[model samples]
Target: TVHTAYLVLSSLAMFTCLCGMAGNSMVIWLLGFRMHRNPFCIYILNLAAADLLFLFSMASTLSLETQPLVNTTDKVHELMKRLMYFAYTVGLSLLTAISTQRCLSVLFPIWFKCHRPRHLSAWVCGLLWTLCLLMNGLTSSFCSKFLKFNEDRCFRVDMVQAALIMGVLTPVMTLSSLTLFVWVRRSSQQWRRQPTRLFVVVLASVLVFLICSLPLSIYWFVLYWLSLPPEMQVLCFSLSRLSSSVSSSANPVIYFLVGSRRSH
Candidate 1:
């Protein structure tokens, strides 16, 4: 029954929220308080902030989902759903921004070093958040005017949003990763033996991005392409949501792992 599925998914969501909240909080503290400001650290701090927000929003959504018998209007649930997607979009945008910034620094070191402004990362972080929020607001407003809010409608909208994002981000991320790979491989004779900290961080971010985000996006695209049954679609959607939460939770773990390696 749907109730059983809700119980299972909500339980997992609660677990994810706890872990993601703790992990992202630590990343923010370590990067923002303990470490000095740098481009990469700045990006990481902002990424962690976004991840924290996403986890919090997801937690709220899970709370609403877990208590399906509550006497509440659809408006509250709709708002929670929208908020979760907004945070997810912001998080995804920041991840992409981090990757792009890392790639540019590697691809054009001399230019980046010469032209990069002080506290540029902070400014870029602000801009990414602003742009993503505006984009989400505009598109969602347009959709809300035409469509009624319900589970199936929300899922369809989410899938389309994911698909459109995948259409752009998947290629950009793939190209950036491949370029970085080739650049690192051909740079120095010892490059294969000793990867730089920046390279590892970039590689880890991109790898996590690919692993966590790609499957959900692909599943969304497939749902549209194949016209899957409602039951199967809902199941895939639940899995996609689970993957997103897990991926966000994994970001800080990546940082922890990478930090340990660098310290050694």
Candidate 2:
């Protein structure tokens, strides 16, 4: 019965990831090529790229279960798992940057517009990409048993990594979002309904992240020593994964929805 639930949730995740993959790829294509690189669009483009990577690697990791190869070291699965987590880190980092950047821009439009570095977005994207690689790469090397050590040490690294992510980035993103809302509220009143496309996109993206991605993210914390029932764990994991899958897929749809609406 539990296996039935796992199967259903995972298959559903796979389906959603497939759609996200297609949608994000389209976003990447459209943003990457046919237009001049606006600084804000750069963030969106990189976010889409990260989502594409996250969903694809995750989908690949899930696909490996098609043939239950029982082995002590499923190196391929572990590697794909690491890759998926790495992409997750990158996406989270980008979201944080995206929100923070938008917050600053709205709060300080004069400085942002007049002296904003032309390549700041590009640099930030590169920095985040490398930083997440190092962070998740080290964690994976320890935890995936590649450099086999005490399993206890692996869990310790996992905890700290969760702390770094959930503790640090979550609030920064949250606060930045809150700050955005303040500005938006005031701006709407002052300017009599000042709504911009990127503003809505950032707000919607963060809201979805908070709702959908938070659960799967908790699994990172769950590794600490929580004794959740195996069946419940399976169900919850798959359920959260479905949430995250929908989250990843939703952005591109949001972009298209907003993008098309603004054209008229």
Candidate 3:
């Protein structure tokens, strides 16, 4: 039986996932119909699906670990681990893709506007899945052996993956995003006086993702290379795991506060 403190924590975790799932779904609905509707909608769909996938994956892990239903089937657990990696990679890649796309849009509006097409969101998402699946393959070797436990521990490795992704891509994306955004803000007479609400929302999303993800990634790399300090490693590692939930939790707030007002 799980202790009371664990139960409380589980409840909080579950709540976080559920909120992300609900909120991202709403974003999908909004984008499917309303708004200026650009290729970025495709990226948002990918984000929502990934978040939803993680929510379900986390729930499964919780079920296996938290009580009478300890799912001991090693194969099943391994498969779950792979799926979590796939979902996470898909989310991060798409987020990065969105950042890159926006940077291009600001850098070359005529090119972006000229080439942007409708009805490609599905393909865009499909491509993201393909790329992420391929990336997850790199880590499949550790799925069953390296990962252990029910959902509590199941989501732990996800942070390491998240960290790696951000470390490689965040600096580039953040610099490019800021550079383009600044250029647009300064050059555009129309948008200069008024705030670009959508741009602001997107920037906020990127910031939240980076800020929440960075520490965890740095720790993972450090832990991977050299053993972390005894006390700090565990604490930082635990925080890294918790940050995944926080990352998921932020989507709903971003949507509710900054999501498009239109309904799809």
Candidate 4:
């Protein structure tokens, strides 16, 4: 029964991740390379790449889930765990960056535009990826030293600390997003309606992404911290796993819906 369920979800996740991976990659290709250099396109392109990493990571998870848990060697399991951990962290950093950028545009539009030299967004993206990788590398390596695989792979953590970070980032992103909305609403210029609409659409897209991911992250770490009952721990872990999988599906929808709204 467990195998049956894993098979179904893994299959679904594989399909979902594939679509997200392909779609987000295409968005990056188009926005990053094909379109003329626009600051806003640069933002979207970086966001697409972030989501792409997540979809690609899910592909790895699907591959692992295909194998029975018992067969994984310690090395292989560690690599998988580390890969997922790094990908998840990078994805979160990207989401936060996107929101922060939005807030900057609102709060300091002139500064944002004035400082937006050639390759500014590219530099920011490169820095974000570097920082995210460094953070995850330190934390995952610290935790991976303890994951003696039994029935499934596990990573060690002080659940409270992890939850604290995850919970804090979520609201920070949400608040930044809300600030962007307010900025747009109160702008003195006769701004084009299209940008506001695009903002709303993309915000909707990521709000769903947050709704799916943020709570699962909070709960998963909370369970890990408390050392909850085994069954409850498993359930929270599964929900966390499922939320990450949903991200593999959500990226493409964001790009497509936002693109459609902009085009129309």
Per-residue lDDT tens digits of candidate 3, residues 1-264? Answer: 234445665667677767777777776665555563645555666677687787677666666654453455455755775675467556666666767777787788886777766665567768768867765765564434554334323244455565657565787668777876777777774755656775687688777777664554565434544645565555555455456667866765664444444442
Q: Which 10-residue window in model 4 sums to the lowest lDDT?
A: 147-156
Model 2, global lDDT:
0.79
Ranking by TM-score: 2, 1, 4, 3
Candidate that beats the other on TM-score, 1 or 3, i.e. the better one? 1
- Ten contiguous residues minimizing lDDT sum, candidate 1: 142-151
**What is the lDDT, from 0 to 100, of the residue 138 in candidate 4?**
57
Candidate with more favorable, higher lDDT: 2 or 3: 2
Backbone clashes for every candidate come to 0, 0, 2, 1
Please give, for residues 28-128, the per-residue lDDT of candidate 4 as tens digits. Answer: 66664546344556656666776677667667766765577575545575576666666666667666766777688769878887776778777887887
Model 1 agreement with the true structure over 1-264: per-residue lDDT tens digits: 865775686678679878999999977766646464455677677878888888887787777765673558345766766666677777777777766776787899987888888678877778878877876665466445333435555456566676667876667766776687767767853645656665666676777687766655567445545667676666677777777888899977775546443234
RMSD of each: 4.0, 2.6, 5.5, 4.5
Choose 2 or 3, whichever is better by TM-score: 2
Q: Which residue ranges in model 1 land beyond 4 Å of their true spot?
A: 1-6, 69-73, 145-164, 189-192, 196-204, 215-226, 256-264
Clashes of 1: 0
TM-scores, all candidates, are: 0.80, 0.89, 0.73, 0.76
Clashes of 3: 2
